[PDB]
Design a protein around this ligand. Structure first.
Ligand SMILES: Nc1ccc2[nH]ccc2n1
Length: 502
C-alpha cells in the first residue's frame, strides 16, 4: 500500500521474503547498505527474484531499464498501471503487480522506540494536543508496545489527560488485548485511527496526529546537528515514508499535446499548482502548459525544469506573465556531456527575440560561485513593458552530491534575497536546475528556512522535514537525497552561527 519500502532489509532477506511470502509479480523496494542514493526494486517473476537498480545522485530516481522518476511512489504507481513497460536487459517484461508490505514501524512519525511512559507523558503534556499520540516499547513487558494518547481541552487544569494502551506482540501479530490481531503496528494504528477505542466512561481515544519531534529552536540547531550526526538517515527515512500521501494528479503534463514539453516524461507538475500560461498563440492548440509549479511558503517561487529548445519561448512567457524579476539557475548548461538546460539568454551585450518576447543581456558580472546576468525583458511591439530580470547562475554545484560547505550557497541566496526585496511588487523568484526538483527544491527549502531566521531572528522555531513535506505537496519530489537533506541543515546551521558571531 504505502508499505512496499523496506528500510532495514538485506538482499537475501528481500529474496527469501519474495520467495516465501510473495508470488510472481510481488515486489518491494529497499535502500543499499553501502551507497546512499542507491536503491533496489526487488521483483519476483517466473519463480525467481530479479533486482533492479535505481540510482539517485540528486536530480531524479533513475531506474535501470526504465524511466526517471521524482519519487519512488510515483515510480511504483507508473509501473503498477503500465505492465510490459518495465523491461529486463533481455527485453522481457517485468510486472509489478503485488506490493509486499513491510512490518517495520521505525519510519512512522508516531513510533518512538525506546521511551518510558514518564517521558511520554512529559512530551504529550509539553508538545501534545488533543488527539496527539505515539507508540513506544513497553518497559513493564519486554517485547510489547504501548500506545500513548492525549485527550481533552487545548485551552494544566486537569481536563486533559494521557491514556496508555498496552499493545501485545504475539507471534509477530499485534493486538490491544482483544479483537483483531494485526500484521504490523502500522495496521493496528491505522485501524484505531479509523475505528477509535472508547473508554468505559466514554472518552474516545482519538488518534488525530503524531507527536512533533522534528521542530527545534533555531538557536539550538548546533545541538540537533551534533545529535543527528550519530540519525539524519532515520529522520530523512520518516520524511520519505510520507511521500505516499502526495500522489496528486498531473493530468495536464500527461496530455499528448504536452509530451515533448517535459524534459523527463514522468516528472510532471501537479495540476493544482502548475503555472498556467495565458495569451498563447491562437494557432497552437495547447499553449497554456509549462513544466513549472508555484511554491508558496506555508515571497513565493516558481520551481521549473531547465528549458528545452522548444520550451524557451514558453519560459519567457512565464517570466513575463508572472512578473518575475529574479531567476535562479543551479545547473551548468552541460554536465557529464549531457544538456541539462538550453541557453535561453542572449550573450553579453546581445539582444534576442524569443517568440513575442525580446531579451537584452545588458551586463554580466562574475563572482566566485556564480555569474549574474542583467537582462531586460519586454514584449515585442510594446516598449513600456520592459523590466529588468536578474539571472543568478550558480556554476560550481558539484556534478554529483552537494557542496562540502554551505557558505557559497548562503552568500548566493542572500544576494538573490536582497535583489528580490529591492524590486517593488516583483513576482515569484524562478528557480530551475535540470528536472527542477532536486537542486531546485534544495535551494528553495534553504531560502524559506533562512527567511524565517531573517524575519524572526535566532530565537524562532524551524522544522526542516515539515518545510520539505509542505514544498513536496506543491511539486513532486522536491529535495531528492539524504545528502541534500543534510546540506539544508548544514546551511541553516552556518547561517545561525554567523548571526551569533555578531
Ligand atoms: N519509506 C520510503 C518510501 C520511499 C522512499 N524513497 C527513498 C526512501 C524511501 N522510504
Amino acid at each position: 500500500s504505502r508499505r512496499w519500502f523496506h528500510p532495514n532489509i538485506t538482499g537475501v532477506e528481500a529474496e527469501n521474503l519474495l520467495l516465501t511470502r510473495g508470488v510472481d509479480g510481488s515486489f518491494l523496494a529497499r535502500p543499499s547498505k553501502s551507497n546512499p542514493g542507491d536503491f533496489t526494486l526487488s521483483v519476483r517473476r517466473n519463480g525467481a527474484v530479479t533486482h533492479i537498480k535505481i540510482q539517485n545522485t540528486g536530480d531524479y530516481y533513475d531506474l535501470y531499464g526504465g524511466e526517471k522518476f521524482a519519487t519512488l511512489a510515483e515510480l511504483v504507481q507508473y509501473y503498477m498501471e503500465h505492465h510490459g513497460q518495465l523491461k529486463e536487459k533481455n527485453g522481457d517484461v517485468i510486472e509489478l503487480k503485488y506490493p509486499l508490505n513491510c512490518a517495520d514501524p521505525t519510519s512512522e512519525r508516531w513510533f518512538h522506540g525506546h521511551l518510558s511512559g514518564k517521558e511520554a507523558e512529559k512530551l504529550l503534556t509539553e508538545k501534545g494536543k488533543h488527539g496527539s499520540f505515539l507508540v513506544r516499547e513497553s518497559q513493564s513487558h519486554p517485547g510489547d508496545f504501548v500506545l500513548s494518547v492525549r485527550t481533552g481541552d487545548d485551552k494544566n487544569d486537569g481536563k486533559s489527560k494521557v491514556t496508555h494502551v498496552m499493545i501485545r506482540c504475539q507471534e509477530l501479530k499485534y493486538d490491544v488485548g482483544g479483537g483483531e490481531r494485526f500484521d504490523s503496528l502500522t495496521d493496528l494504528v491505522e485501524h484505531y485511527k479509523k475505528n477509535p477505542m472508547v473508554e468505559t466512561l466514554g472518552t474516545v481515544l482519538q488518534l488525530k496526529q503524531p507527536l512533533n519531534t522534528t521542530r527545534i529552536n533555531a538557536a539550538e540547531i548546533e545541538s540537533r546537528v551534533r545529535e543527528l550526526s550519530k540519525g539524519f538517515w532515520e529522520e530523512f527515512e520518516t520524511l520519505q515514508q510520507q511521500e505516499c500521501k502526495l500522489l496528486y494528479s498531473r493530468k495536464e503534463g500527461q496530455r499528448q499535446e504536452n509530451k515533448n514539453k517535459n524534459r523527463y516524461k514522468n516528472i510532471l507538475p501537479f495540476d493544482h499548482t502548475r503555472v498556467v500560461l495565458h495569451d498563447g498563440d491562437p494557432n497552437e492548440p495547447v499553449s497554456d502548459y509549462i513544466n513549472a509549479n508555484i511554491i508558496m511558503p506555508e515571497k513565493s517561487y516558481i520551481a521549473t525544469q531547465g528549458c528545452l529548445q522548444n520550451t524557451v519561448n514558453d519560459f519567457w512567457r512565464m517570466v513575463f506573465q508572472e512578473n518575475s524579476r529574479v531567476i535562479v539557475m543551479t545547473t551548468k548548461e552541460v554536465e557529464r556531456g549531457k544538456s541539462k538546460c538550453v541557453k535561453y539568454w542572449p550573450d553579453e551585450y546581445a539582444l534576442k527575440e524569443y517568440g513575442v518576447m525580446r531579451v537584452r543581456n545588458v551586463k554580466e558580472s562574475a563572482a566566485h560561485d556564480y555569474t549574474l546576468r542583467e537582462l531586460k525583458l519586454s514584449k515585442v511591439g510594446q516598449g513600456n513593458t520592459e523590466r529588468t530580470v536578474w539571472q543568478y547562475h550558480f556554476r560550481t554545484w558539484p556534478d554529483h552530491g552537494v557542496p562540502s560547505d554551505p557558505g557559497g550557497v548562503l552568500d548566493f541566496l542572500e544576494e538573490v534575497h536582497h535583489k528580490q526585496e529591492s524590486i517593488m511588487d516583483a513576482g515569484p523568484v524562478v528557480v530551475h536546475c535540470s528536472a527542477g526538483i532536486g537542486r531546485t527544491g534544495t535551494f528553495i527549502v534553504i531560502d524559506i528556512l533562512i527567511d524565517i531566521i531573517r524575519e524572526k531572528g535566532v530565537d524562532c522555531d524551524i522544522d526542516v522535514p515539515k518545510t520539505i513535506q509542505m514544498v513536496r505537496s506543491q511539486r513532486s519530489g522536491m529535495v531528492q537525497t539524504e545528502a541534500q537533506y543534510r546540506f539544508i541543515y548544514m546551511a541553516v546551521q552556518h547561517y545561525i552561527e554567523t548571526l551569533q558571531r555578531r
